[PDB]
Design a protein around this nucleic acid. Structure first.
Ligand code: K
Ligand code: MG
Ligand code: MG
Ligand code: MG
Ligand code: MG
Ligand code: MG
Ligand code: MG
Ligand code: MG
Ligand code: MG
Ligand code: MG
Ligand code: MG
Ligand code: MG
Ligand code: MG
Ligand code: MG
Ligand code: MG
Ligand code: MG
Ligand code: MG
Ligand code: MG
Ligand code: MG
Ligand code: MG
Ligand code: MG
Ligand code: MG
Ligand code: MG
Ligand code: MG
Ligand code: MG
Ligand code: MG
Ligand code: MG
Ligand code: MG
Ligand code: MG
Ligand code: MG
Ligand code: MG
Ligand code: MG
Ligand code: MG
Ligand code: MG
Ligand code: MG
Ligand code: MG
Ligand code: MG
Ligand code: MG
Ligand code: MG
Ligand code: MG
Ligand code: MG
Ligand code: MG
Ligand code: MG
Ligand code: MG
Ligand code: MG
Ligand code: MG
Ligand code: MG
Ligand code: MG
Ligand code: MG
Ligand code: MG
Ligand code: MG
Ligand code: MG
Ligand code: MG
Ligand code: MG
Ligand code: MG
Ligand code: MG
Ligand code: MG
Ligand code: MG
Ligand code: MG
Ligand code: MG
Ligand code: MG
Ligand code: MG
Ligand code: MG
Ligand code: MG
Ligand code: MG
Ligand code: MG
Ligand code: MG
Ligand code: MG
Ligand code: MG
Ligand code: MG
Ligand code: MG
Ligand code: MG
Ligand code: MG
Ligand code: MG
Ligand code: MG
Ligand code: MG
Ligand code: MG
Ligand code: MG
Ligand code: MG
Ligand code: MG
Ligand code: MG
Ligand code: MG
Ligand code: MG
Ligand code: MG
Ligand code: MG
Ligand code: MG
Ligand code: MG
Ligand code: MG
Ligand code: MG
Ligand code: MG
Ligand code: MG
Ligand code: MG
Ligand code: MG
Ligand code: MG
Ligand code: MG
Ligand code: MG
Ligand code: MG
Ligand code: MG
Ligand code: MG
Ligand code: MG
Ligand code: MG
Ligand code: MG
Ligand code: MG
Ligand code: MG
Ligand code: MG
Ligand code: MG
Ligand code: MG
Ligand code: MG
Ligand code: MG
Ligand code: MG
Ligand code: MG
Ligand code: MG
Ligand code: MG
Ligand code: MG
Ligand code: MG
Ligand code: MG
Ligand code: MG
Ligand code: MG
Ligand code: MG
Ligand code: MG
Ligand code: MG
Ligand code: MG
Ligand code: MG
Ligand code: MG
Ligand code: MG
Ligand code: MG
Ligand code: MG
Ligand code: MG
Ligand code: MG
Ligand code: MG
Ligand code: MG
Ligand code: MG
Ligand code: MG
Ligand code: MG
Ligand code: MG
Ligand code: MG
Ligand code: MG
Ligand code: MG
Ligand code: MG
Ligand code: MG
Ligand code: MG
Ligand code: MG
Ligand code: MG
Ligand code: MG
Ligand code: MG
Ligand code: MG
Ligand code: MG
Ligand code: MG
Ligand code: MG
Ligand code: MG
Ligand code: MG
Ligand code: MG
Ligand code: MG
Ligand code: MG
Ligand code: MG
Ligand code: MG
Ligand code: MG
Ligand code: MG
Ligand code: MG
Ligand code: MG
Ligand code: MG
Ligand code: MG
Ligand code: MG
Ligand code: MG
Ligand code: MG
Ligand code: MG
Ligand code: MG
Ligand code: MG
Ligand code: MG
Ligand code: MG
Ligand code: MG
Ligand code: MG
Ligand code: MG
Ligand code: MG
Ligand code: MG
Ligand code: MG
Ligand code: MG
Ligand code: MG
Ligand code: MG
Ligand code: MG
Ligand code: MG
Ligand code: MG
Ligand code: MG
Ligand code: MG
Ligand code: MG
Ligand code: MG
Ligand code: MG
Ligand code: MG
Ligand code: MG
Ligand code: MG
Ligand code: MG
Ligand code: MG
Ligand code: MG
Ligand code: MG
Ligand code: MG
Ligand code: MG
Ligand code: MG
Ligand code: MG
Ligand code: MG
Ligand code: MG
Ligand code: MG
Ligand code: MG
Ligand code: MG
Ligand code: MG
Ligand code: MG
Ligand code: MG
Ligand code: MG
Ligand code: MG
Ligand code: MG
Ligand code: MG
Ligand code: MG
Ligand code: MG
Ligand code: MG
Ligand code: MG
Ligand code: MG
Ligand code: MG
Ligand code: MG
Ligand code: MG
Ligand code: MG
Ligand code: MG
Ligand code: MG
Ligand code: MG
Ligand code: MG
Ligand code: MG
Ligand code: MG
Ligand code: MG
Ligand code: MG
Ligand code: MG
Ligand code: MG
Ligand code: MG
Ligand code: MG
Ligand code: MG
Ligand code: MG
Ligand code: MG
Ligand code: MG
Ligand code: MG
Ligand code: MG
Ligand code: MG
Ligand code: MG
Ligand code: MG
Ligand code: MG
Ligand code: MG
Ligand code: MG
Ligand code: MG
Ligand code: MG
Ligand code: MG
Ligand code: MG
Ligand code: MG
Ligand code: MG
Ligand code: MG
Ligand code: MG
Ligand code: MG
Ligand code: MG
Ligand code: MG
Ligand code: MG
Ligand code: MG
Ligand code: MG
Ligand code: MG
Ligand code: MG
Ligand code: MG
Ligand code: MG
Ligand code: MG
Ligand code: MG
Ligand code: MG
Lengths: 48, 275
RNA sequence: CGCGGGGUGGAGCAGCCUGGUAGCUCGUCGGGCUCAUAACCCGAAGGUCGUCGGUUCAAAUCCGGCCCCCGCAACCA
RNA sequence: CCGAGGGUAGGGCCCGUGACUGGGGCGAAGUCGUAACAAGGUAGCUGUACCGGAAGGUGCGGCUGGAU
RNA sequence: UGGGAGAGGGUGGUGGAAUUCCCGGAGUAGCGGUGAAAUGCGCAGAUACCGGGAGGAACGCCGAUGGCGAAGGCAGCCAC
RNA sequence: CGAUGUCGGCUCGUCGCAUCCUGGGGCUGAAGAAGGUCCCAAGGGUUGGGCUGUUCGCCCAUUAAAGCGGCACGCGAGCUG
RNA sequence: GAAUGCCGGCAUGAGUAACGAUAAAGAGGGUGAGAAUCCCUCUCGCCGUAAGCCCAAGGGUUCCUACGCAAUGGUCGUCAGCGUAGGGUUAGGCGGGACCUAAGGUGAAGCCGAAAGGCGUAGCCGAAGGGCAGCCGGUUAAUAUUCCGGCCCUUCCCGCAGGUGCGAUGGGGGGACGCUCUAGGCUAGGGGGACCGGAGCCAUGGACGAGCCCGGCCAGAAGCGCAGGGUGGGAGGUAGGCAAAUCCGCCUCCCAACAAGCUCUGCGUGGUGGGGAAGCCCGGGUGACAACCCCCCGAAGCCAGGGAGCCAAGAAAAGCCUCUAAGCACAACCUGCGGGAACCCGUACCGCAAACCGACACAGGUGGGCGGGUGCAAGAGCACUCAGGCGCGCGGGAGAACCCUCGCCAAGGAACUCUGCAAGUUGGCCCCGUAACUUCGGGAGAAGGGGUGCUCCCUGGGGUGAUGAGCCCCGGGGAGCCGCAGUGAACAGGCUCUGGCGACUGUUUACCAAAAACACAGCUCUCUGCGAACUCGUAAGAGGAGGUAUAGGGAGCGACGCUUGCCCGGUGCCGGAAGGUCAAGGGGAGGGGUGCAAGCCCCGAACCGAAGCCCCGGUGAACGGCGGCCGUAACUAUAACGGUCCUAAGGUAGCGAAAUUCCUUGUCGGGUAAGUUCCGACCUGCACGAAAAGCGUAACGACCGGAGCGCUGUCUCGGCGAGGG
RNA sequence: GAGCUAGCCCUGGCCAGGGUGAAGCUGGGGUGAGACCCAGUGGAGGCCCGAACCGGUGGGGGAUGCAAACCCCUCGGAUGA
RNA sequence: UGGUUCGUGGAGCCAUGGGGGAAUCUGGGCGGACCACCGCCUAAGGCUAAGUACUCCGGGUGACCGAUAGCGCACCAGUAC
């Protein structure tokens, strides 16, 4: 049957992307936390 | 003269449709249309705020002249009567001798080829617009400004009309289409005659899909829902109301008046409505 | 021996709660008016209060037991 | 090939009969009231309408086959 | 051909009397109703009187024992 | 109750005897035939249908007879639902 | 030593289940240490509206080549989407950007919010919509509308020539529109040829033939040809299109009019450039100077912005054209020609799947285009086949029980069972024929029946063409032939009668319920006079609605028919300027503390004092409710009638053992051999009843009940056979 | 977090083939004129049969599955909510 | 209304959303309702080291751990998944 993951590059970048995160107070905390934790990637990979 | 159909589908049994007999032109003026943004009953939050809206046929809004005192004294000619899907009345196209073109609500019995005009000196004649204080007592008028220069507010749907009852100072006494008696300022404009297409109320929609064409989605009874949804929700089997009949939001819906108590127009309502 | 209500002139109901008193409508009996009957008018009689036992100076009335009659309930499985 | 008739299937008319049900006629002395006949004690009749244990009553319009 | 009388019929318009309701004034202890009553209504101000307003229906006197129509039926007044 | 799946049916049996039939008897208000009642006996047998989820029961047609109970109201790691 | 403890290791079940669609395999020859499994050849089978081809999304080297087989691959492995290395994606015209705008997003102005932030006109962003210039062939191991060849075209800059009041983010035109049905003429595609080209073939009884087999085109600028779309010209006035306008809109005048003219597309033709089969012998080469022609069928595509009808009334903006303003008329724009200039990103490969989403090389899921032929009435259905692609990554045997999927069955024919569950039957098309009832449409494919192949002969109308022949499409009659059987295989209703419920088509518990449930047109009540009510929001602001009582919100009821009774005492709502009660506040009778005192400070009665409540009325398609005991008639029985108690009033019509009835399998009737179900009645209705509507209702239903006919392995009662295990 | 699912908004796309044959229109009949009837034409519809497509009715299989909802037969809608 | 130990308490003090609304030392606030007496202090402007907190960083030391311990990571770890 049709499952839950149906990838879509524009969707991905526009929902979880760097510019979406920077626009909003909670998004900047996501970025702040993932830097303090030392994540190699602050935001999902999508090829644009 | 609403039109019936033979019973060759279950729905054709009862469906009735307007005769469209007065319409003389079947596409609108390219210069007087604009796109009508369907809302689905959602506001700028994206939230539904008027339930059960959406899915209607695409429409173009026709710009309608509800002022008409824009052009005191300039006579116009009735070039066409047209179908307008944004209202129940028909609409009329006016070619002013100006060359300017406008749409107006089509009063009852207005004829293609005749002329209308706006102003204090205008004849008392079907289609003309005058400040209320110059229209003789007893006259049947439509498209009535509620306040001077603010725009024609009252008696605009198919077949409605207001009747001029008397004068009192700067104000005129009107009997609205609801039967209420009200003071309306004398300089407010009005148009002689009743709104046309009076048979509009005798159309029989005949099937559910027809309501879907109009943008009306199906309405769910409170008694059909669950307690988390509605005051009438729940119950084993069917259930009577079991409380004063209420809206989804809890307020009483059989008799409970809701006009605001201290509203300033109260000094202007003479008698409440009828029937 | 699940929980309620009732039993009082001939019928249908008060009085019981708050102990001392039996009442109301109809019906029945006698006499009027009527040619006569009903209606109407004047008078009259009939009830020891389902029963037994206790309390009391005194029980339709308060408390126990027995009879007779109506009503409600009987769920989770 | 036609063909008596037999078989299958589906209709039309008539008769008899059926739990139960609707009124109808009739029947020496049943129960309830008293609608009509006199101005019958609300003049009656009437077409229709609504209502009521029953006759009836009432509305609307009509008739004199009504009286003083 | 020229004349007449008529509530003959259909459409539009339109006049006054009267009842009801509404508003304003004025005014107070009852009004209404019946064979007699009670219900009802009235000091939260009724009835009775005046001014204004709204609305529907029916056309007094003329009018008659009258007139018209095939019958049912037809009555303020104006015009078609 | 850190689970002993619970009615009826179907399938498959097995057992008890307080015996429905078949076998052997006594008594009889046992003439015969046919019954009634009690005793011995569990080897074998104990049908097909209509109704109801039904167990049970009533009915139809038969029959030598259409027995009554136990096996976790026998049997859901065998089926049904 | 225990915590169904935690982490790790290793046992048991066990050489057990399983190795993933039952589309299917066999042999020869290669290679290699090793071969059912890799490569090649012949045979066989499977898909073919796909299981073939082209796009898009997603994936991200998986593509090509060489060398490899530890692990990955459900077995094997020499093979591979695996490991190592090298190689591979080429654009002014394709797609996106340097263009347009849609929802929406954002947002100078502005508005709002303790903060964070929320709004918001224009404007900006935003596409699979608008707009816009490239077609055919060749070449690589691997890219190609990109490289190459042939022939075309677009914009930008600059120069020359001719022309013109040139000039814009501004004004206008246009762009620019739905659904169903559809004309003319074409193209795609397809069928046939006794004509044209071709390597060959003659078999096993016949055939050297008007035999077999194969192939008979594609792209193209200007020009012309056919078919279409778009489109009035001139003049005078002019107050309107937020300045101006010679433009547009309005009025009048003359001419033009189913046309023509000008314009713009499509198709055909076209200089020219390409392609080219079988067979054959090593993707190649030959064929081959390949030929390339005629007839038919024919789109849903093209001409297109075509036509008609209908109601539910069918984006925007730019490019483009026209108008003028500032300005500039050495300029600038238009037209024709010439030279130059022309950037960024994608391009490999998979793509109904072993490379995408499902932990797997997973029988599931995934949007657009092409989708050939024959027969079957048609078709994208069904059967077989073209091109192309496969045989599904464990095999070999055996021929038990039992299981799955499938075939048949003597006599019986629902006896099975909760239930005909299941499986049979029926099954397309042509004709004949068809009932109650009905809202006159329907019920209807009612039911039930007959026909259906092939051959010869005669004949009717149509399409193309030319009216003829040919091709092709509908048919009509007569005479015969064969079989058990002619929609001979495949695809393709079993039917009737009668109840309950719901009018109906629809909708639902993704993944145990599809229904009688929700919805529905329609009916009623009620709120709402517009800055509406109502809804979301602290707000600003939105929705409602660019709507205005024939409108919008809320509620119940549920097509339609005939109807919807009595109770307003309680609760609700609605009306009531009296009266009663009532808060803060006003008022301050009279008290109290402190000071020597002026004064400061505290308490406080009466009285004035809203909504709400009380009280007075109204109101049921508002919440709701609609009696008990006893007596009575000239057989009995039963009570039309009466008596009395209680209520706010004591259930009317209609219906009733019901989707409701406990006693209950009520009683009687029908159907059956027999009927706790069914149907029709009755009425002591435990505990129907009139918009939580009452009683009916034609049509409808994968709803639930009862009966009959047809037919059956459901069953008496089982047997045999097939394949996967 | 609305790349699943639910509703709405903007813009696109898709629905083989066959069947039934409403209104209107034309002609004819009819009448004072009408209503209306007949024939032809016409192509309406939450119309009918049936693929794609969307569903998920009954049964069987599956049940450490091919699959954490699948498979086979059967069945509903298929110009419209 | 908040703050303080103070939860309405005899409830002052400090702060302040609403209403009313002075004075310039003979002016004003405080000493826990209020008055008197006696005292303390000068609101409605601003700034001001040090002593105090912490440990991303560097070093010093452990009756701290010693690869299931010690940080989640002794190791190419905020990685693989
Ligand atoms: K329970
Ligand atoms: Mg899904
Ligand atoms: Mg998606
Ligand atoms: Mg994307
Ligand atoms: Mg995308
Ligand atoms: Mg997206
Ligand atoms: Mg977002
Ligand atoms: Mg982003
Ligand atoms: Mg910040
Ligand atoms: Mg890094
Ligand atoms: Mg992130
Ligand atoms: Mg109709
Ligand atoms: Mg009809
Ligand atoms: Mg009209
Ligand atoms: Mg437009
Ligand atoms: Mg426009
Ligand atoms: Mg809007
Ligand atoms: Mg918004
Ligand atoms: Mg949000
Ligand atoms: Mg709403
Ligand atoms: Mg809505
Ligand atoms: Mg409207
Ligand atoms: Mg209109
Ligand atoms: Mg006004
Ligand atoms: Mg309506
Ligand atoms: Mg609409
Ligand atoms: Mg509605
Ligand atoms: Mg509803
Ligand atoms: Mg409910
Ligand atoms: Mg519910
Ligand atoms: Mg919720
Ligand atoms: Mg709640
Ligand atoms: Mg609630
Ligand atoms: Mg409720
Ligand atoms: Mg409920
Ligand atoms: Mg209930
Ligand atoms: Mg419910
Ligand atoms: Mg109710
Ligand atoms: Mg209730
Ligand atoms: Mg309520
Ligand atoms: Mg409210
Ligand atoms: Mg009003
Ligand atoms: Mg008492
Ligand atoms: Mg006493
Ligand atoms: Mg007495
Ligand atoms: Mg005598
Ligand atoms: Mg007497
Ligand atoms: Mg014979
Ligand atoms: Mg007697
Ligand atoms: Mg009488
Ligand atoms: Mg009499
Ligand atoms: Mg009389
Ligand atoms: Mg009398
Ligand atoms: Mg009466
Ligand atoms: Mg009185
Ligand atoms: Mg009084
Ligand atoms: Mg007074
Ligand atoms: Mg009135
Ligand atoms: Mg237990
Ligand atoms: Mg355990
Ligand atoms: Mg267990
Ligand atoms: Mg069985
Ligand atoms: Mg014996
Ligand atoms: Mg004997
Ligand atoms: Mg004997
Ligand atoms: Mg014995
Ligand atoms: Mg035995
Ligand atoms: Mg035995
Ligand atoms: Mg039984
Ligand atoms: Mg039992
Ligand atoms: Mg029983
Ligand atoms: Mg015997
Ligand atoms: Mg037993
Ligand atoms: Mg037991
Ligand atoms: Mg038991
Ligand atoms: Mg068992
Ligand atoms: Mg089981
Ligand atoms: Mg069982
Ligand atoms: Mg077990
Ligand atoms: Mg077992
Ligand atoms: Mg067990
Ligand atoms: Mg069950
Ligand atoms: Mg221990
Ligand atoms: Mg464990
Ligand atoms: Mg543990
Ligand atoms: Mg342990
Ligand atoms: Mg563990
Ligand atoms: Mg380890
Ligand atoms: Mg372990
Ligand atoms: Mg191990
Ligand atoms: Mg092991
Ligand atoms: Mg082992
Ligand atoms: Mg073994
Ligand atoms: Mg074993
Ligand atoms: Mg296994
Ligand atoms: Mg497996
Ligand atoms: Mg298969
Ligand atoms: Mg198979
Ligand atoms: Mg196959
Ligand atoms: Mg072989
Ligand atoms: Mg082989
Ligand atoms: Mg091998
Ligand atoms: Mg090998
Ligand atoms: Mg193999
Ligand atoms: Mg090979
Ligand atoms: Mg061979
Ligand atoms: Mg094919
Ligand atoms: Mg991947
Ligand atoms: Mg290997
Ligand atoms: Mg290996
Ligand atoms: Mg190696
Ligand atoms: Mg492996
Ligand atoms: Mg595998
Ligand atoms: Mg090798
Ligand atoms: Mg090797
Ligand atoms: Mg490559
Ligand atoms: Mg190029
Ligand atoms: Mg550039
Ligand atoms: Mg833009
Ligand atoms: Mg912030
Ligand atoms: Mg954007
Ligand atoms: Mg853009
Ligand atoms: Mg685009
Ligand atoms: Mg568009
Ligand atoms: Mg392009
Ligand atoms: Mg080209
Ligand atoms: Mg090469
Ligand atoms: Mg110019
Ligand atoms: Mg347009
Ligand atoms: Mg439409
Ligand atoms: Mg054509
Ligand atoms: Mg072509
Ligand atoms: Mg063809
Ligand atoms: Mg001008
Ligand atoms: Mg060649
Ligand atoms: Mg050559
Ligand atoms: Mg198409
Ligand atoms: Mg087109
Ligand atoms: Mg068109
Ligand atoms: Mg726009
Ligand atoms: Mg100048
Ligand atoms: Mg110059
Ligand atoms: Mg020019
Ligand atoms: Mg650039
Ligand atoms: Mg690039
Ligand atoms: Mg490429
Ligand atoms: Mg698929
Ligand atoms: Mg692949
Ligand atoms: Mg595989
Ligand atoms: Mg994979
Ligand atoms: Mg797969
Ligand atoms: Mg071909
Ligand atoms: Mg066919
Ligand atoms: Mg295979
Ligand atoms: Mg396959
Ligand atoms: Mg396999
Ligand atoms: Mg094997
Ligand atoms: Mg074997
Ligand atoms: Mg055979
Ligand atoms: Mg058989
Ligand atoms: Mg049979
Ligand atoms: Mg048979
Ligand atoms: Mg049966
Ligand atoms: Mg049985
Ligand atoms: Mg069943
Ligand atoms: Mg069959
Ligand atoms: Mg068949
Ligand atoms: Mg019949
Ligand atoms: Mg019939
Ligand atoms: Mg029938
Ligand atoms: Mg019927
Ligand atoms: Mg009919
Ligand atoms: Mg048939
Ligand atoms: Mg037929
Ligand atoms: Mg024949
Ligand atoms: Mg043959
Ligand atoms: Mg069929
Ligand atoms: Mg339904
Ligand atoms: Mg339903
Ligand atoms: Mg119903
Ligand atoms: Mg109905
Ligand atoms: Mg449908
Ligand atoms: Mg479900
Ligand atoms: Mg569920
Ligand atoms: Mg679930
Ligand atoms: Mg299911
Ligand atoms: Mg359900
Ligand atoms: Mg269904
Ligand atoms: Mg539902
Ligand atoms: Mg509903
Ligand atoms: Mg319905
Ligand atoms: Mg209404
Ligand atoms: Mg709110
Ligand atoms: Mg706030
Ligand atoms: Mg708006
Ligand atoms: Mg209805
Ligand atoms: Mg309905
Ligand atoms: Mg309902
Ligand atoms: Mg009827
Ligand atoms: Mg009634
Ligand atoms: Mg009441
Ligand atoms: Mg009341
Ligand atoms: Mg009340
Ligand atoms: Mg008050
Ligand atoms: Mg109640
Ligand atoms: Mg009550
Ligand atoms: Mg009954
Ligand atoms: Mg019964
Ligand atoms: Mg019933
Ligand atoms: Mg009941
Ligand atoms: Mg019963
Ligand atoms: Mg029962
Ligand atoms: Mg019985
Ligand atoms: Mg019987
Ligand atoms: Mg029955
Ligand atoms: Mg009875
Ligand atoms: Mg109910
Ligand atoms: Mg029905
Ligand atoms: Mg029916
Ligand atoms: Mg249905
Ligand atoms: Mg259904
Ligand atoms: Mg049945
Ligand atoms: Mg049957
Ligand atoms: Mg049968
Ligand atoms: Mg069998
Ligand atoms: Mg086998
Ligand atoms: Mg999306
Ligand atoms: Mg989604
Ligand atoms: Mg569209
Ligand atoms: Mg379709
Ligand atoms: Mg047909
Ligand atoms: Mg026809
Ligand atoms: Mg037409
Ligand atoms: Mg349909
Ligand atoms: Mg059909
Ligand atoms: Mg299924
Ligand atoms: Mg599905
Ligand atoms: Mg089945
Ligand atoms: Mg499962
Ligand atoms: Mg399946
Ligand atoms: Mg199937
Ligand atoms: Mg279709
Ligand atoms: Mg269908
Ligand atoms: Mg639609
Ligand atoms: Mg504190
Ligand atoms: Mg505090
Ligand atoms: Mg304090
Ligand atoms: Mg303050
Ligand atoms: Mg001082
Ligand atoms: Mg001072
Ligand atoms: Mg202070
Ligand atoms: Mg102090
Ligand atoms: Mg002190
Ligand atoms: Mg101090
Ligand atoms: Mg410091
Ligand atoms: Mg140590
Ligand atoms: Mg370690
Ligand atoms: Mg560690
Ligand atoms: Mg350690
Ligand atoms: Mg660290
Ligand atoms: Mg570290
Ligand atoms: Mg660790
Ligand atoms: Mg570690
Ligand atoms: Mg790592």
């Amino acid at each position: 049957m049709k499952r839950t993951w149906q990838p879509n590059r524009r969707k991905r970048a526009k929902t979880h992307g760097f510019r979406a995160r920077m626009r909003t107070p909670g998004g900047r905390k996501v970025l702040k936390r993932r830097r303090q934790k030392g994540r190699w990637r602050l935001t999902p990979a999508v090829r644009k | 003269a609403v039109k019936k159909f033979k019973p060759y589908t279950p729905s054709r049994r009862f469906m009735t449709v307007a005769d469209f007999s007065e319409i003389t032109k079947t596409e609108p003026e390219k210069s007087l249309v604009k796109p009508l943004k369907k809302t689905g009953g959602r506001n700028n939050q994206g939230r539904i705020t008027v339930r059960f809206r959406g899915g209607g046929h695409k429409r173009l809004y026709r710009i309608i002249d509800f002022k008409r005192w824009d052009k005191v004294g300039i006579p116009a000619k009735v070039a066409a009567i047209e179908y307008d899907p944004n209202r129940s009345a028909r609409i009329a196209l006016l070619h002013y001798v100006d060359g300017e073109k406008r749409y107006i609500i089509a009063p009852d019995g207005l004829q293609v080829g005749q002329q209308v005009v706006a102003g204090p000196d205008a004849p008392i004649q079907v289609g003309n617009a005058l400040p209320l204080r110059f229209i003789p007592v007893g006259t049947v008028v439509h498209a009535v400004e509620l306040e001077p220069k603010k725009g024609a507010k009252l008696a605009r749907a198919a077949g409605t009309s207001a009747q001029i009852q008397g004068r009192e100072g700067d104000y005129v006494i009107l009997r609205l289409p609801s039967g209420e008696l009200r003071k309306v300022h004398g300089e407010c404009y009005a148009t002689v005659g009743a709104v046309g297409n009076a048979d509009h109320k005798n159309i029989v929609l005949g099937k559910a899909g027809r309501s879907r064409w109009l943008g009306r989605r199906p309405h769910v009874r409170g008694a059909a829902m669950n307690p988390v949804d509605h005051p009438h929700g729940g119950g084993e089997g069917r259930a009577p109301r079991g409380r004063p009949p209420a809206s989804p939001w809890g307020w009483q819906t059989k008799g409970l008046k809701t006009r605001k108590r201290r509203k300033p127009s109260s000094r202007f309502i003479i008698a409440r409505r009828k029937k």
